Amino acid sequence: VLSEGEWQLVLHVWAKVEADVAGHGQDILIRLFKSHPETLEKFDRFKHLKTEAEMKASEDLKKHGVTVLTALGAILKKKGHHEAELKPLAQSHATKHKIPIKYLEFISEAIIHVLHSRHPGDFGADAQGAMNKALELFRKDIAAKYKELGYQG
């Protein structure tokens, strides 16, 4: 679990992210695709985006960056009480798109990496420690829903 203090850290950071979601979304998605190209496949509008510049110009890529952070931010603001929110989430990603939990881990790596490079004095060792906990709780609460739907890859 996370404490009220830890939750304070995570929400304080995200507030800055949402101050520029589109921008944070591009960096994070582009960071995710570069580090793990396989996840790129999971988007059909991207059977052609190769260079980084192409990713930077893709209107879709940007819209998708907003969808993730928007939703993730919504989940983080629940400070742990997000079970009902994850239901539809796990439903669509597990069955409709078949996204492995491993991918959730990848995007978490990209999120930490991007926040660290972007919000220095706003994402200190303590803050990064709290975000790691938040995203972790997130993943495990999702996998729980994954097996419920019997999601077995």
PDB file of all heavy atoms in Angstrom, residues 39-61:
ATOM      1  N   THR A  39       5.583  -3.367 -28.786  1.00  0.00           N
ATOM      2  CA  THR A  39       4.336  -2.753 -28.337  1.00  0.00           C
ATOM      3  C   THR A  39       3.756  -1.824 -29.400  1.00  0.00           C
ATOM      4  O   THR A  39       2.552  -1.566 -29.427  1.00  0.00           O
ATOM      5  CB  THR A  39       4.544  -1.953 -27.036  1.00  0.00           C
ATOM      6  OG1 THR A  39       5.403  -0.834 -27.289  1.00  0.00           O
ATOM      7  CG2 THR A  39       5.175  -2.837 -25.966  1.00  0.00           C
ATOM      8  N   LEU A  40       4.623  -1.324 -30.274  1.00  0.00           N
ATOM      9  CA  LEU A  40       4.212  -0.428 -31.349  1.00  0.00           C
ATOM     10  C   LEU A  40       3.173  -1.117 -32.231  1.00  0.00           C
ATOM     11  O   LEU A  40       2.190  -0.507 -32.653  1.00  0.00           O
ATOM     12  CB  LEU A  40       5.439  -0.044 -32.181  1.00  0.00           C
ATOM     13  CG  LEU A  40       5.293   0.955 -33.328  1.00  0.00           C
ATOM     14  CD1 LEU A  40       4.666   2.246 -32.829  1.00  0.00           C
ATOM     15  CD2 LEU A  40       6.669   1.222 -33.920  1.00  0.00           C
ATOM     16  N   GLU A  41       3.409  -2.399 -32.489  1.00  0.00           N
ATOM     17  CA  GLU A  41       2.542  -3.233 -33.314  1.00  0.00           C
ATOM     18  C   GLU A  41       1.072  -3.127 -32.893  1.00  0.00           C
ATOM     19  O   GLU A  41       0.176  -3.077 -33.734  1.00  0.00           O
ATOM     20  CB  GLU A  41       3.007  -4.690 -33.199  1.00  0.00           C
ATOM     21  CG  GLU A  41       2.636  -5.593 -34.358  1.00  0.00           C
ATOM     22  CD  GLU A  41       3.089  -7.023 -34.125  1.00  0.00           C
ATOM     23  OE1 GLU A  41       4.243  -7.211 -33.684  1.00  0.00           O
ATOM     24  OE2 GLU A  41       2.297  -7.954 -34.386  1.00  0.00           O
ATOM     25  N   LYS A  42       0.843  -3.077 -31.586  1.00  0.00           N
ATOM     26  CA  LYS A  42      -0.503  -3.006 -31.019  1.00  0.00           C
ATOM     27  C   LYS A  42      -1.394  -1.828 -31.440  1.00  0.00           C
ATOM     28  O   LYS A  42      -2.543  -1.719 -30.994  1.00  0.00           O
ATOM     29  CB  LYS A  42      -0.402  -3.072 -29.496  1.00  0.00           C
ATOM     30  CG  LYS A  42       0.035  -4.437 -28.990  1.00  0.00           C
ATOM     31  CD  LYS A  42      -0.972  -5.510 -29.395  1.00  0.00           C
ATOM     32  CE  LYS A  42      -0.628  -6.854 -28.771  1.00  0.00           C
ATOM     33  NZ  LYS A  42      -1.663  -7.892 -29.041  1.00  0.00           N
ATOM     34  N   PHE A  43      -0.864  -0.949 -32.286  1.00  0.00           N
ATOM     35  CA  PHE A  43      -1.621   0.189 -32.786  1.00  0.00           C
ATOM     36  C   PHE A  43      -1.641   0.055 -34.292  1.00  0.00           C
ATOM     37  O   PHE A  43      -0.601  -0.068 -34.947  1.00  0.00           O
ATOM     38  CB  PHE A  43      -0.997   1.514 -32.338  1.00  0.00           C
ATOM     39  CG  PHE A  43      -1.179   1.792 -30.865  1.00  0.00           C
ATOM     40  CD1 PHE A  43      -0.382   1.154 -29.916  1.00  0.00           C
ATOM     41  CD2 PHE A  43      -2.159   2.674 -30.425  1.00  0.00           C
ATOM     42  CE1 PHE A  43      -0.562   1.395 -28.553  1.00  0.00           C
ATOM     43  CE2 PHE A  43      -2.346   2.920 -29.063  1.00  0.00           C
ATOM     44  CZ  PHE A  43      -1.546   2.279 -28.128  1.00  0.00           C
ATOM     45  N   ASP A  44      -2.841   0.053 -34.832  1.00  0.00           N
ATOM     46  CA  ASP A  44      -3.003  -0.157 -36.247  1.00  0.00           C
ATOM     47  C   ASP A  44      -2.698   1.074 -37.067  1.00  0.00           C
ATOM     48  O   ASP A  44      -2.289   0.966 -38.226  1.00  0.00           O
ATOM     49  CB  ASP A  44      -4.423  -0.656 -36.521  1.00  0.00           C
ATOM     50  CG  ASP A  44      -4.791  -1.876 -35.679  1.00  0.00           C
ATOM     51  OD1 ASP A  44      -3.879  -2.577 -35.181  1.00  0.00           O
ATOM     52  OD2 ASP A  44      -6.000  -2.137 -35.532  1.00  0.00           O
ATOM     53  N   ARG A  45      -2.888   2.244 -36.469  1.00  0.00           N
ATOM     54  CA  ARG A  45      -2.604   3.479 -37.180  1.00  0.00           C
ATOM     55  C   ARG A  45      -1.099   3.602 -37.293  1.00  0.00           C
ATOM     56  O   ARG A  45      -0.599   4.521 -37.937  1.00  0.00           O
ATOM     57  CB  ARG A  45      -3.123   4.715 -36.436  1.00  0.00           C
ATOM     58  CG  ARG A  45      -4.477   4.578 -35.780  1.00  0.00           C
ATOM     59  CD  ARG A  45      -4.349   3.880 -34.452  1.00  0.00           C
ATOM     60  NE  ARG A  45      -5.628   3.806 -33.762  1.00  0.00           N
ATOM     61  CZ  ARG A  45      -6.023   2.749 -33.065  1.00  0.00           C
ATOM     62  NH1 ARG A  45      -5.232   1.689 -32.978  1.00  0.00           N
ATOM     63  NH2 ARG A  45      -7.205   2.747 -32.464  1.00  0.00           N
ATOM     64  N   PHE A  46      -0.369   2.689 -36.648  1.00  0.00           N
ATOM     65  CA  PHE A  46       1.089   2.737 -36.696  1.00  0.00           C
ATOM     66  C   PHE A  46       1.743   1.500 -37.298  1.00  0.00           C
ATOM     67  O   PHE A  46       2.489   0.796 -36.617  1.00  0.00           O
ATOM     68  CB  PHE A  46       1.690   2.965 -35.301  1.00  0.00           C
ATOM     69  CG  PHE A  46       0.953   3.969 -34.462  1.00  0.00           C
ATOM     70  CD1 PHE A  46       0.917   3.823 -33.081  1.00  0.00           C
ATOM     71  CD2 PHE A  46       0.311   5.060 -35.036  1.00  0.00           C
ATOM     72  CE1 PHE A  46       0.254   4.744 -32.283  1.00  0.00           C
ATOM     73  CE2 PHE A  46      -0.359   5.991 -34.242  1.00  0.00           C
ATOM     74  CZ  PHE A  46      -0.387   5.829 -32.862  1.00  0.00           C
ATOM     75  N   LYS A  47       1.454   1.229 -38.568  1.00  0.00           N
ATOM     76  CA  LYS A  47       2.078   0.113 -39.272  1.00  0.00           C
ATOM     77  C   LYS A  47       3.082   0.775 -40.208  1.00  0.00           C
ATOM     78  O   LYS A  47       3.579   0.150 -41.146  1.00  0.00           O
ATOM     79  CB  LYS A  47       1.053  -0.683 -40.100  1.00  0.00           C
ATOM     80  CG  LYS A  47       0.507  -1.946 -39.440  1.00  0.00           C
ATOM     81  CD  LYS A  47      -0.388  -2.709 -40.413  1.00  0.00           C
ATOM     82  CE  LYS A  47      -1.081  -3.900 -39.759  1.00  0.00           C
ATOM     83  NZ  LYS A  47      -0.138  -5.003 -39.420  1.00  0.00           N
ATOM     84  N   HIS A  48       3.378   2.048 -39.937  1.00  0.00           N
ATOM     85  CA  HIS A  48       4.306   2.818 -40.763  1.00  0.00           C
ATOM     86  C   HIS A  48       5.226   3.806 -40.030  1.00  0.00           C
ATOM     87  O   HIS A  48       6.302   4.134 -40.533  1.00  0.00           O
ATOM     88  CB  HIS A  48       3.526   3.560 -41.851  1.00  0.00           C
ATOM     89  CG  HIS A  48       2.438   4.446 -41.323  1.00  0.00           C
ATOM     90  ND1 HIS A  48       1.371   3.967 -40.593  1.00  0.00           N
ATOM     91  CD2 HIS A  48       2.248   5.782 -41.431  1.00  0.00           C
ATOM     92  CE1 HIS A  48       0.572   4.970 -40.276  1.00  0.00           C
ATOM     93  NE2 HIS A  48       1.081   6.082 -40.772  1.00  0.00           N
ATOM     94  N   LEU A  49       4.814   4.289 -38.860  1.00  0.00           N
ATOM     95  CA  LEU A  49       5.651   5.221 -38.103  1.00  0.00           C
ATOM     96  C   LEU A  49       6.981   4.555 -37.742  1.00  0.00           C
ATOM     97  O   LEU A  49       7.027   3.694 -36.865  1.00  0.00           O
ATOM     98  CB  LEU A  49       4.934   5.670 -36.826  1.00  0.00           C
ATOM     99  CG  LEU A  49       4.369   7.094 -36.812  1.00  0.00           C
ATOM    100  CD1 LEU A  49       3.291   7.253 -37.873  1.00  0.00           C
ATOM    101  CD2 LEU A  49       3.811   7.388 -35.436  1.00  0.00           C
ATOM    102  N   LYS A  50       8.055   4.962 -38.419  1.00  0.00           N
ATOM    103  CA  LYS A  50       9.385   4.392 -38.190  1.00  0.00           C
ATOM    104  C   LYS A  50      10.326   5.296 -37.398  1.00  0.00           C
ATOM    105  O   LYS A  50      10.753   4.947 -36.296  1.00  0.00           O
ATOM    106  CB  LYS A  50      10.032   4.034 -39.531  1.00  0.00           C
ATOM    107  CG  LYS A  50       9.249   3.000 -40.326  1.00  0.00           C
ATOM    108  CD  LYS A  50       9.886   2.727 -41.677  1.00  0.00           C
ATOM    109  CE  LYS A  50       9.847   3.964 -42.559  1.00  0.00           C
ATOM    110  NZ  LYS A  50      10.398   3.701 -43.914  1.00  0.00           N
ATOM    111  N   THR A  51      10.658   6.451 -37.962  1.00  0.00           N
ATOM    112  CA  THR A  51      11.555   7.388 -37.296  1.00  0.00           C
ATOM    113  C   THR A  51      10.890   7.996 -36.067  1.00  0.00           C
ATOM    114  O   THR A  51       9.696   7.801 -35.834  1.00  0.00           O
ATOM    115  CB  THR A  51      11.961   8.540 -38.233  1.00  0.00           C
ATOM    116  OG1 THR A  51      10.817   9.358 -38.509  1.00  0.00           O
ATOM    117  CG2 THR A  51      12.514   7.994 -39.539  1.00  0.00           C
ATOM    118  N   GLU A  52      11.669   8.734 -35.285  1.00  0.00           N
ATOM    119  CA  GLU A  52      11.148   9.384 -34.092  1.00  0.00           C
ATOM    120  C   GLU A  52      10.350  10.595 -34.561  1.00  0.00           C
ATOM    121  O   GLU A  52       9.281  10.899 -34.029  1.00  0.00           O
ATOM    122  CB  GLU A  52      12.295   9.838 -33.187  1.00  0.00           C
ATOM    123  CG  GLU A  52      11.894  10.062 -31.739  1.00  0.00           C
ATOM    124  CD  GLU A  52      13.021  10.644 -30.909  1.00  0.00           C
ATOM    125  OE1 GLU A  52      14.179  10.211 -31.093  1.00  0.00           O
ATOM    126  OE2 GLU A  52      12.747  11.524 -30.064  1.00  0.00           O
ATOM    127  N   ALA A  53      10.884  11.274 -35.572  1.00  0.00           N
ATOM    128  CA  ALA A  53      10.243  12.453 -36.145  1.00  0.00           C
ATOM    129  C   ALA A  53       8.842  12.100 -36.637  1.00  0.00           C
ATOM    130  O   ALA A  53       7.907  12.890 -36.496  1.00  0.00           O
ATOM    131  CB  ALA A  53      11.083  12.999 -37.293  1.00  0.00           C
ATOM    132  N   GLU A  54       8.702  10.914 -37.220  1.00  0.00           N
ATOM    133  CA  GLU A  54       7.403  10.464 -37.706  1.00  0.00           C
ATOM    134  C   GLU A  54       6.447  10.325 -36.524  1.00  0.00           C
ATOM    135  O   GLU A  54       5.275  10.693 -36.615  1.00  0.00           O
ATOM    136  CB  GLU A  54       7.540   9.127 -38.436  1.00  0.00           C
ATOM    137  CG  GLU A  54       7.932   9.257 -39.897  1.00  0.00           C
ATOM    138  CD  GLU A  54       8.147   7.912 -40.570  1.00  0.00           C
ATOM    139  OE1 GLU A  54       7.457   6.939 -40.197  1.00  0.00           O
ATOM    140  OE2 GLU A  54       8.995   7.830 -41.481  1.00  0.00           O
ATOM    141  N   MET A  55       6.956   9.798 -35.416  1.00  0.00           N
ATOM    142  CA  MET A  55       6.154   9.629 -34.210  1.00  0.00           C
ATOM    143  C   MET A  55       5.776  10.987 -33.638  1.00  0.00           C
ATOM    144  O   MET A  55       4.680  11.169 -33.111  1.00  0.00           O
ATOM    145  CB  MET A  55       6.932   8.828 -33.160  1.00  0.00           C
ATOM    146  CG  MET A  55       6.879   7.327 -33.372  1.00  0.00           C
ATOM    147  SD  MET A  55       8.041   6.415 -32.334  1.00  0.00           S
ATOM    148  CE  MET A  55       8.148   4.869 -33.248  1.00  0.00           C
ATOM    149  N   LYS A  56       6.694  11.939 -33.758  1.00  0.00           N
ATOM    150  CA  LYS A  56       6.486  13.290 -33.254  1.00  0.00           C
ATOM    151  C   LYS A  56       5.392  14.024 -34.025  1.00  0.00           C
ATOM    152  O   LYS A  56       4.713  14.893 -33.478  1.00  0.00           O
ATOM    153  CB  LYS A  56       7.794  14.081 -33.352  1.00  0.00           C
ATOM    154  CG  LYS A  56       7.778  15.438 -32.664  1.00  0.00           C
ATOM    155  CD  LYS A  56       7.875  15.296 -31.154  1.00  0.00           C
ATOM    156  CE  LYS A  56       8.087  16.646 -30.485  1.00  0.00           C
ATOM    157  NZ  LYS A  56       8.311  16.511 -29.018  1.00  0.00           N
ATOM    158  N   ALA A  57       5.223  13.670 -35.294  1.00  0.00           N
ATOM    159  CA  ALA A  57       4.225  14.316 -36.140  1.00  0.00           C
ATOM    160  C   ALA A  57       2.885  13.593 -36.174  1.00  0.00           C
ATOM    161  O   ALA A  57       1.859  14.199 -36.484  1.00  0.00           O
ATOM    162  CB  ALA A  57       4.767  14.463 -37.558  1.00  0.00           C
ATOM    163  N   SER A  58       2.888  12.301 -35.865  1.00  0.00           N
ATOM    164  CA  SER A  58       1.657  11.519 -35.882  1.00  0.00           C
ATOM    165  C   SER A  58       0.590  12.108 -34.970  1.00  0.00           C
ATOM    166  O   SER A  58       0.753  12.146 -33.749  1.00  0.00           O
ATOM    167  CB  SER A  58       1.941  10.074 -35.466  1.00  0.00           C
ATOM    168  OG  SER A  58       0.745   9.312 -35.428  1.00  0.00           O
ATOM    169  N   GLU A  59      -0.501  12.572 -35.571  1.00  0.00           N
ATOM    170  CA  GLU A  59      -1.601  13.148 -34.810  1.00  0.00           C
ATOM    171  C   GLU A  59      -2.174  12.056 -33.909  1.00  0.00           C
ATOM    172  O   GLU A  59      -2.473  12.295 -32.740  1.00  0.00           O
ATOM    173  CB  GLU A  59      -2.681  13.671 -35.761  1.00  0.00           C
ATOM    174  CG  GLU A  59      -3.685  14.609 -35.107  1.00  0.00           C
ATOM    175  CD  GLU A  59      -3.067  15.934 -34.703  1.00  0.00           C
ATOM    176  OE1 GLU A  59      -1.848  16.114 -34.914  1.00  0.00           O
ATOM    177  OE2 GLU A  59      -3.803  16.796 -34.172  1.00  0.00           O
ATOM    178  N   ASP A  60      -2.318  10.856 -34.467  1.00  0.00           N
ATOM    179  CA  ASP A  60      -2.836   9.714 -33.717  1.00  0.00           C
ATOM    180  C   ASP A  60      -1.989   9.471 -32.478  1.00  0.00           C
ATOM    181  O   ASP A  60      -2.497   9.436 -31.357  1.00  0.00           O
ATOM    182  CB  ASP A  60      -2.824   8.454 -34.584  1.00  0.00           C
ATOM    183  CG  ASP A  60      -4.091   8.290 -35.389  1.00  0.00           C
ATOM    184  OD1 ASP A  60      -4.975   9.166 -35.296  1.00  0.00           O
ATOM    185  OD2 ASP A  60      -4.205   7.286 -36.117  1.00  0.00           O
ATOM    186  N   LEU A  61      -0.689   9.298 -32.697  1.00  0.00           N
ATOM    187  CA  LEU A  61       0.258   9.055 -31.618  1.00  0.00           C
ATOM    188  C   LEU A  61      -0.026  10.013 -30.470  1.00  0.00           C
ATOM    189  O   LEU A  61      -0.013   9.619 -29.304  1.00  0.00           O
ATOM    190  CB  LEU A  61       1.686   9.273 -32.122  1.00  0.00           C
ATOM    191  CG  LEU A  61       2.868   8.655 -31.363  1.00  0.00           C
ATOM    192  CD1 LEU A  61       2.840   9.055 -29.896  1.00  0.00           C
ATOM    193  CD2 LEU A  61       2.813   7.146 -31.502  1.00  0.00           C
TER     194      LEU A  61
END
